[PDB]
Design a protein around this ligand. Structure first.
Ligand SMILES: Nc1nc2c(ncn2[C@@H]2O[C@H](COP(=O)(O)OP(=O)(O)O)[C@@H](O)[C@H]2O)c(=O)[nH]1
Ligand SMILES: [Mg+2]
Length: 170
């Protein structure tokens, strides 16, 4: 059967996790998507000529119990850790999301990509060097994205799949 990559999108409210996921899946930019809604998406893609399925959980950081949330956090193969380049607080929050992933995976080596979203906006308060320095500290890729323009969106998800492939061949 076709290989499935189970991916989880995490980060502070308002960074564009839902917009990024819908851009990947539906190829349009959504201005308004309920900040409390957590849902999974499945998409067949070709990455470096490998036809595969992306099984993505768009997390919403809500209190209410979800069996699906626990399952994706436990069995997820890769995580997008998303901040917004015009939201210093969302960048300050990244370490908390990475710590949560390491604890649920019981691993120091979980495939992850650091995503700086909203790179279409001129009011950048988190610079490339700061983001590259954090990614280097974690030993993970840094990808700049815009859910609005689609800049870097395929690159973010496809880079995470390449990190998972590397982990599986370790
Ligand atoms: N300019 C810009 N706005 C964005 C981008 N991605 C998301 N947004 C906006 O940021 C707000 C929060 O996005 P959303 O996907 O709900 O964030 P989530 O809470 O992380 O799921 C919304 O008003 C979006 O339209 C982007 O790349 N550029
Ligand atoms: Mg959302």
């Amino acid at each position: 059967g076709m290989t499935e990559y189970k991916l989880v999108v995490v980060g502070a409210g308002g960074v564009g996790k839902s917009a990024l996921t819908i851009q990947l899946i539906q190829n349009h930019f959504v201005d308004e998507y309920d900040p409390t809604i957590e849902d999974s998406y499945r998409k067949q893609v070709v990455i470096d000529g490998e036809t595969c399925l992306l099984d993505i959980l768009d997390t919403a950081g809500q209190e209410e119990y979800s069996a699906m949330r626990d399952q994706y956090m436990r069995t997820g193969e890769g995580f997008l850790c998303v901040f917004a380049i015009n939201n210093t607080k969302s960048f300050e929050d990244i370490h908390h999301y990475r710590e949560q992933i390491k604890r649920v995976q019981d691993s120091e080596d979980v495939p992850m990509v650091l995503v700086g979203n909203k790179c279409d906006l001129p009011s950048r308060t988190v610079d490339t060097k700061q983001a590259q320095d954090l990614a280097r500290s974690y030993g993970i890729p840094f990808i700049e994205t815009s859910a609005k323009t689609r800049q870097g969106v395929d690159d973010a998800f496809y880079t995470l799949v390449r990190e998972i492939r590397k982990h599986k061949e370790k």
